[PDB]
Structure formats: C-alpha cells, structure tokens
C-alpha cells in the first residue's frame, strides 16, 4: 500500500514508524484540597459599585468552575485568551476576582478594546486581558419598585482610566473654565451619580 501496487519487487522499503503507545494518564497536581470560598463573590449579599469595585485575591484554591452554572442564568461567559471550558485542568498561581454591578446595555463595554463610559471612567480592561468576564441579571435581588438609587458610577473624569485602577476619590469636576474651588454648582457637576433600577 505504500508503493500503490499489488506486487512488490525485491528490496527494502520504509513503510511506517514504530511509535510506542502511552499507558497511563498521570496528573500529579499540587497538594491542595482547601476549597476556598469561591461562592463568597457570586452568591453573596449586595454587590460593590463600579467606582469601588471589590478585588479579591484568590490563591491556594481548587477552582471548581462547575458550581457557577447551577445557579441563576449566567450570561456572557466570554474568556479572553482561554476557552470557556477546559479550565478544570489548568493550575494558575493566583487569580483576582473583580466584582461589581453595571447596566444591561453596558455589559459590552467590559471587554478588551471596547470603550465608552464604564470602560473609560470606572473599570478598564487591558488589551492582553487573560481572564473571563461572567455576568448575570439581578433584577430580583438588586431591584425593587420604590426607586433604587443605591448604586453609584462615575460620569466625568479628567482622563481615561488606566487598566486595573480603582478611583475612589471625590474631587469635584469642572466642565468649564470657572474655578469652582469645591462648590458643586454650575459647571461643577458631581463626578459620582447614582443609578436607577426599576
């Protein structure tokens, strides 16, 4: 079959390569069984705002990504750099969970390269962002019919926020050339305004 003929002449002919097949599937992962509280940032009480996003360093963990799907419908599970699945076979050194609450139409801006209002003044992701963004609607846990104004966000800032930077300052903005020197009035708009969730 390697010569494509039903009759072979006299001589030596190379046909294939004797490659020994594997036997076992040794893993040899580190010695870690402490299932750290990965549910403390997913199923907890009220969530952080965008200008004060909570950044929890998670190390010495057993990252079981098969526990965030049996919960409420998690949408837009977009991993940049890795696949959504096949995350249960990789050993990371230390991960960071940045938790906050945004609007429905503002979920697109949480992505490398995308710009807007939340991705430029509240939380910016770098172009080499090797992580996963996970969003889910909370209209039953973060909304009530009374007028919901317990979530703040920044609208005005001098320059664009650099990737992985938390801006919790309260310096007044100046939309014009008038030296407001801290009065919060005409052309001195407050930099942090509240949301409206009905």
């Amino acid at each position, epitope marked *: 079959c390697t010569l494509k003929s039903f009759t072979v002449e006299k001589g030596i002919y190379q046909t294939s390569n004797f490659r020994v097949q594997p036997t076992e599937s040794i893993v040899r992962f580190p010695n870690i069984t402490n299932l750290c509280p990965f549910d403390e940032v997913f199923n907890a009480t009220r969530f952080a705002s965008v200008y004060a996003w909570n950044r929890k360093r998670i190390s010495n963990c057993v990252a079981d990504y098969s526990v965030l799907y049996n919960l409420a419908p998690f949408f837009t599970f977009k991993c940049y750099g890795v696949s959504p699945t096949k995350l249960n076979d990789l050993c990371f050194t230390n991960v960071y969970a940045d938790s906050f609450v945004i609007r429905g*139409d503002e979920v*697109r801006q949480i992505a490398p390269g995308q710009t807007g209002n939340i991705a430029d003044y509240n939380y910016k992701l770098p172009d080499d962002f090797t992580g996963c963004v996970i969003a889910w609607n909370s209209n039953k846990l973060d909304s009530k019919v009374s007028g919901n104004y317990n979530y703040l966000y920044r609208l*005005f800032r001098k320059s664009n926020l650099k990737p992985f930077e938390r801006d919790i300052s309260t310096e007044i903005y100046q*939309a*014009g*050339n008038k030296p407001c020197n801290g009065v919060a009035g005409f*052309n001195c708009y407050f930099p942090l305004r509240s949301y409206s969730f009905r």
Partner: nanobody
Amino acid sequence: EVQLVESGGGLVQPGGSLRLSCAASDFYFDYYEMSWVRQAPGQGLEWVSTISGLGGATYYADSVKGRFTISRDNSKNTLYLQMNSLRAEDTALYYCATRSPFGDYAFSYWGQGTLVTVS
C-alpha cells in the same frame, strides 16, 4: 439637578414616519446646544444630529444626511425630530442631550430615551 422628558412613538413600519419631541423647561437653552445620540441594541452610542443656540446651524451624521432633519422651537423650549424613510437597521433608543459649546466634549445632561423598533 434639573431634567425633563422626551415623548413620541414607540414603533413605526419600515417606510412610515415619526415625530419625536424632547420637551425641556427652566433651562438656559438659547445659548446652549442640543443634540440627539442614538444607541443600537447591543452596540455603543452614535451621534445623529446636533443644533446650536448661537446661530442655529445644524449638523447631521453622514449616514442620515438626507433622511433626518431637526428643528428647535425656542418658544416651547422643545426639540423636534422628524424622521424620513425609516429603514430596518435604524432601530435605536434616541437620547436627548444638551451641552455648552464653551466646554469639553462631555455631554452635560442626558435625557430619558425611548427605544423605537422597526419591522
């Protein structure tokens, strides 16, 4: 702060017409400038058209040059939007935003906005 509302239609056939009206009051409008800014479902923001208060010169977007025209009524302090030849890919929630020309590129106030879908 001070903020007002905008009304109009909520659905229009692909080929009809619609008259959107952003109603403002108790504001220094004649020296300010107004503009409409749309938002496609699943996309970002896009500047549709703008009018000034100083000279009243209008500026439209390159995609809506011959399909959208606006006019500000200073007697009623409202902004009109008469859309012509509505296609199927122009569905977006239009926001009514006013800003001062002697400032920065950031919108001062944002309207309520309403989504108008086309069949």
